[model samples]
Target: MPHAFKPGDLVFAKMKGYPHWPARIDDIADGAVKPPPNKYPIFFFGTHETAFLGPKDLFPYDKSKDKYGKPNKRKGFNEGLWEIQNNPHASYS
Candidate 1:
């Protein structure tokens, strides 16, 4: 069971049908928020996009490789990393 992460915290988020991409937490958007269930804005490293995601999609990024690396092996993992690494800072579209 994953606990709720805080803003400014770095995490790895996995969108449905996507790999666990390297990401960091973004503050809640200007729109009104609700309780019982909520989502957050996740800044993806490689893609350089800030997307809304749920708790199930996130985890401690530093721990991503501790469990013997990616489960699928090679796919999804490097793609995100390389894209993120090559991107320039503040280059968001």
Candidate 2:
């Protein structure tokens, strides 16, 4: 088992073929189907996108920039930020 992740935690979440992009955990829940329910969860990102993954996939900025990385950065986190920015022509601010 890996470290216990919490909501609002900044991390690098991975998806096959994608970089270990900068991400954050917005929530956690139990899934009886998967013994470790919270093992997989949502992610936040460099292009302001989100993903569903947790494992060697999630690297919470625990060290130097030795893990996967995305060029963009994060700021002013909120539950709706992703939704609003999902706009077709909006800047990735």
Q: lDDT of all the models against the reference?
A: 0.63, 0.50
Query: Any residue pairs clashing in model 2, and if so which?
Result: none
TM-score of 1: 0.58
Writing each residue's lDDT as its tens digit, candidate 2 over 11-61 gives: 656567555555566543465233254465554543565455645677765
lDDT tens per residue, model 1, 4-93: 787766677877777667777766557845323577778876556677777787877667745423444435455556543454234355
RMSD of 1: 5.2
Among residues 3 or more apart in sequence or in different chains, the pairs in candidate 1 whose N, CA or C atoms overlap within 3 Å are 46-84
Local lDDT at 46 for model 2 = 33
TM-score per model over all chains: 0.58, 0.50
- The residue ranges of model 2 lying beyond 4 angstroms of the native Cα positions read 1-3, 28-36, 70-93
User: How much lDDT does candidate 1 score?
Assistant: 0.63
